[PDB]
Design an enzyme around this catalytic site. Structure first.
Site, PDB file in Angstrom:
ATOM      1  N   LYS B  34       0.867   2.356   7.535  1.00 55.17           N
ATOM      2  CA  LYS B  34      -0.374   1.647   7.831  1.00 55.17           C
ATOM      3  C   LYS B  34      -0.935   0.923   6.610  1.00 55.17           C
ATOM      4  CD  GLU B  69       5.859   9.898  15.095  1.00 57.30           C
ATOM      5  OE1 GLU B  69       4.688  10.003  15.519  1.00 57.30           O
ATOM      6  OE2 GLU B  69       6.812   9.519  15.809  1.00 57.30           O
ATOM      7  N   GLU B  72       9.749   2.675  17.906  1.00 58.48           N
ATOM      8  CA  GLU B  72      10.645   1.542  18.104  1.00 58.48           C
ATOM      9  C   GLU B  72      10.146   0.626  19.218  1.00 58.48           C
ATOM     10  N   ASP B 114     -11.427   1.859  20.889  1.00 56.53           N
ATOM     11  CA  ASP B 114     -10.674   0.609  20.816  1.00 56.53           C
ATOM     12  C   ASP B 114      -9.307   0.722  21.484  1.00 56.53           C
ATOM     13  CD  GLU B 118      -3.906  -5.760  22.154  1.00 55.58           C
ATOM     14  OE1 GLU B 118      -4.212  -4.754  22.828  1.00 55.58           O
ATOM     15  OE2 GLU B 118      -4.513  -6.849  22.247  1.00 55.58           O
TER      16      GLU B 118
END
Ligand SMILES: Oc1ccccc1-c1nc(N[C@H]2CCNC2)c2ccccc2n1
Ligand SMILES: Oc1ccccc1-c1nc(N[C@H]2CCNC2)c2ccccc2n1
Lengths: 265, 265
Positions: B34, B69, B72, B114, B118
């Site tokens: 992040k 982690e 994918e 939020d 996404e």
């Protein structure tokens, strides 16, 4: 049980949460030391106004100690309990200063959120003096609806946009009470006798009124208090607006005050 | 410009705020790192659930780096844009897991605040996989009205007592949208064509409906979404209540899922 760093520079003693008294171990002058905890410390440090407690030094760890120049006058509470009331001049002068502090706070996007006679300290025992306010433990710094805007979202939040900003009015409300008290001598919203839930009582705004005493107050004073206890935060007198109110247009209030500042130097 | 401590243990590379990809300099396995800032770090550390991003290690200073982690599957968004819609099974399975996370959060007095496609990441590219949620930068930990109680006070606050607690419903709302989207393919509350302020549109709850597509969805699925987009947070389906809803009573959803967990070991 006193930290070594503390007792080194001061002589902590009696009791005045609750705050304790101590003597400056270098000047023999007296001061008071205070005893979401960082907030008050961080704010009391930003506080720089006459009618507001001013910090002299800070020391943490163990338990929390914030030493400020001591107010001899004590609590405004003490002076107006047992339904002892106070003179119009006393009130006008007193409250006037409160209005200045509460204003200066809001101007700095600061909310006290716990304004009561207790938290209103006085300068000297005399019935005429300056008054500051302490206990910023409940305060808040107001910056969030901007995140909501320029973007989805849930309904309740969107509607919340029509209220944001007036989170400070609560101080005006409490100020109105504090004033009401001083002027009258009795609580506007008291669970005494009467009946009906306090929530239903305070939310309605139907304050307990007793003319048998409210007949001595000024013709402008009451009208102020009245316009100060409004159930609608949007129509509730702003700290700024209040100062412009007639009952606060008193050369005396600003003459026995504008000089009492030089009485500090 | 990379801190020395960082590049020592990993190989920061591309871009996936926005987050970057890096390779574990010891295992050659890939992971994502992040890039009110302590809040997310503090919360992401408390996060310990399958359908929620799990942190592997943390490193501060300079700029902020939190390695987790890697997922994918990417963004749920990617899979349902260009009005591509998704199969009922996909939704039920997907959304089901969302419901588990959002629930586990609220159970821990946590609000995401939020939730959007996404922020809903997937396991593997396949149309069937597990999904977690990230970006806890807006979250909040909910513990204040107790201070108001047992005590004066301003009216607006007292009335506020009748709302406190349902600050989490917003996640259910957004979940409803996220669901609506996946099932339909189009925004419930879109400023597209139509007209009328979005605030007036979303606050009313009159979502834009088009049967020309909503005719393919299940007879229970729509009824769920409908009962999920309620303008009243008090009557809005709780994350718990939703899981009990008929459309989420699917042995298939809990069979293609309860096993996909062992597909991690
Ligand atoms: O002299 C001071 C100088 C700077 C800051 C505070 C004080 C102060 N503070 C008090 N106390 C509190 C208890 C909770 N609200 C009011 C107090 C209480 C009684 C008598 C004197 C007091 N003097
Ligand atoms: O693989 C991960 C493992 C742990 C935590 C996150 C991720 C992650 N995160 C993304 N990004 C954000 C940008 C703002 N909301 C979604 C992302 C975006 C695109 C492709 C893969 C991604 N993979």
């Amino acid at each position: 049980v006193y930290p070594k760093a503390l007792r080194d520079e001061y002589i902590m003693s009696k009791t005045l949460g609750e705050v304790k008294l101590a003597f400056e171990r270098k000047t023999c002058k007296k001061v008071a030391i205070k005893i979401n905890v960082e907030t008050e410390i961080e704010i009391l440090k930003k506080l720089n106004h006459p009618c507001i407690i001013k910090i002299k030094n800070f020391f943490d760890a163990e338990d929390y100690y914030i030493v400020l120049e001591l107010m001899e006058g004590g609590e405004l509470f003490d002076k107006v309990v047992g339904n002892k009331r106070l003179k119009e001049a006393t009130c006008k002068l007193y409250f006037y200063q409160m209005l200045l502090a509460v204003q200066y706070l809001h101007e700095n996007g600061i909310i006290h959120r716990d304004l009561k006679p207790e938290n209103v300290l006085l300068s000297s025992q005399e019935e005429d003096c300056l008054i500051k306010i302490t206990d910023f433990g409940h305060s808040k710094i107001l910056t969030s609806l901007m995140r909501t805007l320029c973007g989805y979202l849930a309904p309740e939040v969107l509607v919340s946009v029509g209220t944001a900003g007036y989170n400070r009015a609560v101080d005006c409300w409490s100020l109105g009470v504090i004033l009401f008290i001083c002027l009258s001598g009795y609580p506007p919203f008291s669970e005494h006798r009467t009946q009906v839930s306090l929530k239903d009582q305070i939310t309605s705004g139907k304050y307990n009124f007793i003319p048998e005493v409210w007949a001595e107050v000024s013709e402008k004073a009451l009208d102020l208090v009245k316009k100060l206890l409004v159930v609608d935060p949007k129509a509730r007198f702003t700290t700024e607006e209040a100062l412009r109110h007639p009952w606060l247009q008193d050369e005396d209030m600003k003459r026995k005050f504008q000089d009492l500042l030089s009485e500090e130097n």
